[PDB]
Amino acid sequence: ADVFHLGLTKAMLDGATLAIVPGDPERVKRIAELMDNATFLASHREYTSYLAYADGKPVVICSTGIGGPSTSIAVEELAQLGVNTFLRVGSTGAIQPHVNVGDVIVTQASVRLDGASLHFAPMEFPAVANFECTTAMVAACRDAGVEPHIGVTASSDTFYPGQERYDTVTGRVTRRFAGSMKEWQDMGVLNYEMESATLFTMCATQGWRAACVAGVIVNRTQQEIPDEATMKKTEVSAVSIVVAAAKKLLA
Amino acid sequence: ADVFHLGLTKAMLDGATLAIVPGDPERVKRIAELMDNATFLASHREYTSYLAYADGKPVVICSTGIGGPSTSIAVEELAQLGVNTFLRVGSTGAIQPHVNVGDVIVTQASVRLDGASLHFAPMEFPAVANFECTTAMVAACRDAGVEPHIGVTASSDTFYPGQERYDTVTGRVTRRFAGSMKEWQDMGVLNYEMESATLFTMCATQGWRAACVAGVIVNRTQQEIPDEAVSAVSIVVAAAKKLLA
Amino acid sequence: ADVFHLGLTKAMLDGATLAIVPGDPERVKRIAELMDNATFLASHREYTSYLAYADGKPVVICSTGIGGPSTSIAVEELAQLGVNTFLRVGSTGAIQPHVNVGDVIVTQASVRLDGASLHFAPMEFPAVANFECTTAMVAACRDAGVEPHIGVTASSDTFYPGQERYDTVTGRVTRRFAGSMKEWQDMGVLNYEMESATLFTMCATQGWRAACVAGVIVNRTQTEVSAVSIVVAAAKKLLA
Amino acid sequence: ADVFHLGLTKAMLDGATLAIVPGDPERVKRIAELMDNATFLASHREYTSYLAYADGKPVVICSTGIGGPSTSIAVEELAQLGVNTFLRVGSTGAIQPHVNVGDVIVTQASVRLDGASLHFAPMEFPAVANFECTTAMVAACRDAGVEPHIGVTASSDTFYPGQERYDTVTGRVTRRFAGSMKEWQDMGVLNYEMESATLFTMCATQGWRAACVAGVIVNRTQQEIPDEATMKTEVSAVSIVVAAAKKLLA
Amino acid sequence: ADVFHLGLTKAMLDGATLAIVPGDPERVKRIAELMDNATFLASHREYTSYLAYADGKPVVICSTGIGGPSTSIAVEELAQLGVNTFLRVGSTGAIQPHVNVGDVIVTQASVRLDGASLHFAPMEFPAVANFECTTAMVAACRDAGVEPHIGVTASSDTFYPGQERYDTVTGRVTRRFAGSMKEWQDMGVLNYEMESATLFTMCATQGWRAACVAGVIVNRTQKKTEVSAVSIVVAAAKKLLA
Amino acid sequence: ADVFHLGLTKAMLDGATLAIVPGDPERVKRIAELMDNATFLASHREYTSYLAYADGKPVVICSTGIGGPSTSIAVEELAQLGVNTFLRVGSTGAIQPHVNVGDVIVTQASVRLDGASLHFAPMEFPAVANFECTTAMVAACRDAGVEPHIGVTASSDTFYPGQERYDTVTGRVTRRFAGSMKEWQDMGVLNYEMESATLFTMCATQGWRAACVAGVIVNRTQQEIPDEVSAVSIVVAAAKKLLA
């Protein structure tokens, strides 16, 4: 391998400069197979990598794992191999009662509730997406019949205390994060996830483009975690949107 | 007046929900007169307001003065009168050597080198512009034959040390800002101005839309202060028309 | 001009080394007419400059605008022109029940609720007024038959949430300023204003003198000329 | 499942109250297979879980993925299922010139260069390991003819800038992390890894025991990254952590 | 004892509302003997307490120990027995070339390089002396024909690294304090000592007056002064109790 | 002297490389007399030093005064005189209700409510005790038939507000320390004292060994002020194990 974690060489990317970077190693193939000539490349730790072809052009699909530190490794190593563009697709808990299960969210920037973003810039630096790649995510939603939510996402180093979940062993949340969900709700913050702050801050500072789209799997104003009673029932998927965003950008 | 600083009532706005907010009280009238039926409203302290119409739609033009505290009172008090959109226009120092003087910058989000931003959100919250108004600025540039620089601006509570200016009485920059320019340069930050961090944080947190377009009057890789020698103000009026359509 | 914002030359000030720095442009002229030979200098953005003469010596009267950013520009640009002394006057409310409308506050030092002070020193540095100019401000109060409240002022980057005002569109105050009025009240903080922290920190660190007198015109918990009258006597005290 | 990520139920753990929590899902089965009756429990995302028996005592083996956020999920979710004790085994880079490739380190506490530890306690709280499980870690080294290094570990959210690696696309480290290796050096900080700060802080605060043993793969005084020239043949930190697990469950 | 550390009772103070609070226990008795009818009160840990009379008014002389935390106990427990004014006297070195050995410093406010200050107010709060006590101090200097340096003091939790000293075992200064002296020197900071930040903030926040004079016995950049400083502070006490 | 505060020369220590550092200058002679041939060295400010012999090896017994600034001077100046090991002994107030007044606490590490720590390392650095000296204090408890509480201590710059005491002149604690005792409680913090964060950070960083044992004189679940020894005999016993 040319890179220390991902198990990839530059040859294997066949000149790809754009990656779709989902969180889950298990989504990668499905993503890859919505494009042409999907090929397995590597699987090491949380990092499963496919190649596919969007309208004749090469696209790397590589999982990040949960949260910024695993993300930072993927993003650096892909960029060592010549990726300059990172499209995150993921699931997300809505914190606004008007943001329904199954809606799609385009994250334009992030509340920095991570530590990895600080390894790229002081906290004063905005965790902001690429304008042009956000534009293409928004457009790919609208083509899909979907007006996405566009705004600010709380990006958290934890799924439990940092997203003010109490259904936990101690059911205690440290002072900094006690009340914090209402703080972000009051500020019009749409959702929680766990990687966008890091991906954005490292992309913006290192001169790479990033954006993030995500399907809503629960509303935190009604359930801490989704269960069978939560609406699954499909519609227009964040995975189809990110692929068509990828085509917009390479075309 | 129905507000504590600006000398305005809501009636005076004729139903305007959108403000063009430049810095100089001496630039309000001129911007306004790019519109129709430019109307004096009020001049108090650094707050000169005009009402004008943009293809039939009422627009406040209100100066903010320099720096986020003065901006925060203009933006709060205007909102208390129905404004829900704040389009910032002005001038800037470019800190990238590919941003030429007379370039246009559209500011997506800002480094928070201010204090007023912290009176609305903790520093972890991004100082981010409204996507729709930003999209409207970008389009107005392209209608005028201008491809703007789109990215990150350093928004500083000072003109001198915070923007890493040495041509001062003491010629010292406190540690925290010593080498700060380069840091921002290396980060791909385009420019310095003194309000967008406040404007963007307070609007984002308070459910109002904001955006920022600015013309480049010095390049900081060359010199600290501009030589003593229209497009941005043309674009912001263009954008205001798009958003009120 | 010699300076980027204020539109002044070093010549225009006739060797003046002391400024009277109020916030409001529309107050400059009439502060300057309390002295001899009051002359319009420049008017740019929120910066309206006047010269006049205290017992034969020139004093510059220059407005700052609201808040430490616009203050920071005025103070730096005046200093580029040989000003070494910055007397702030103004009006304020108070957050203590014993501070009645009509009272004067001399601010000895300030809570740093601003950003621009951090552009001159880390937060550990005290936002402290010059002992000499503060003493002059006090003696002028007392000369006028006023015993001023001498204490700590909360200097806020904002009029509204930083001063824990809920009379706003959203009626929301961010967590760090939720409760913050009772905290300052309890620590004996006399009032809020929006400039003294930047002015203080910037003059201390750059080696200039500053002070801040202010008449009380409102008390949240429950004279304009006096405070201008007092600052002008302070200036003569210092230039005598 | 009764936890949201791991795919586990309590019964699946057979009363296990102790996990070995490596980073790598690829390695969970091998670690398991150093115990008895290795049993596949779940695989979801970076989270591969096995049960096995440590001299008749049930042990869960669960991968954390890299860094504190993924670790935090695993530890919360195991602890809903009755785990009260978390032994971290893994690899590390040495930042002291006397700490040789192949030595073992038992981390008694960590520099909190992470964000997830702040989701459990303010920065003033120490990221300290449990005294008992650290002692067991040291006893299981010495049982194996190994004197481990025992001290403070720099626990970093990033592999690259936060460990002051410059062999990167930009070759730039942000001002906070610039010179930071020298700083931890001078402080007698022994090594870099990416999870112990989160784990220690979430465990000490939530009332759960934790410790962490790790084998040195590179010395940062000589190479950013281990390569073929780096030393290949010694007591494994996996052998140590299984040994400690028996002692603690004895 | 009404108070757990100092071993004192309100009755023992005879209505004293003012304390001279020097750092060194061994100095207390002597400070006290500039005054009338000097009377041992208590000695526990680093806290030696005396009562003397300054122009017939009760004055407490109580040692604090070195640094903010020991200072914070003496100040709180004294205040519990009705003390409302605290005059600190000391010697100091000085970090400005224009400050000569034998000069006097009157600290008007202090850089907060302490932790105890933060146990009373966030860092934004200024570590400012009381204006009236400072004035008293300035005027007692002047009455002794001494023109004091009136400025900002760097109040450090440590004698060595927080004062950017390299003459230590390791010779190492942690990044925060690397270059820190030059920074304060540049900002006009006159000196380092180890308590004024704690004393100032706790007194400002709690509603008690404080002030600080100190003779300059050394200057990094380069008895009589100690007798001067303790003489000055006693003079200042009388000014305030008049 | 060879040092700036303590009044000690290297010669006076007789090759002692280990100090016992209690807080109270009045506790020093007493500790020293638990060893052989106890010798007054000096007394300066809050710094009273004795020498004694522990199974034939020199041990310095040096008070630190209250709180990290004074501890930092005494620790630095001892180390200038060849001291590499500092065993701290003292009193403590327990915040967990399962800790009995009269119990022993062995502080593995400290919450840094103290400023002197920051003069040695950033707050991110853990205020961790030395493994071996902590190990030694645990074994010296158990040899004495006492199972000590082992974990985390809240090491505060103040006795009053930093320990969230309200029986004060103002009866007010600043926002950062309001509700803080409950927070430390919920996190399993054992006790409050005022030196261990400075001691541990400064030893850790400077390559010296440090540990702490202390006897519980008040339970803060009951009251704020203690009502009117094993930990001192445990510390002498830990010293002999480490010098053996």
Ligand SMILES: O=c1cc[nH]c(=O)[nH]1
């Ligand atoms: O309660 C107590 C006892 C001793 N030391 C402390 O800090 N607190």
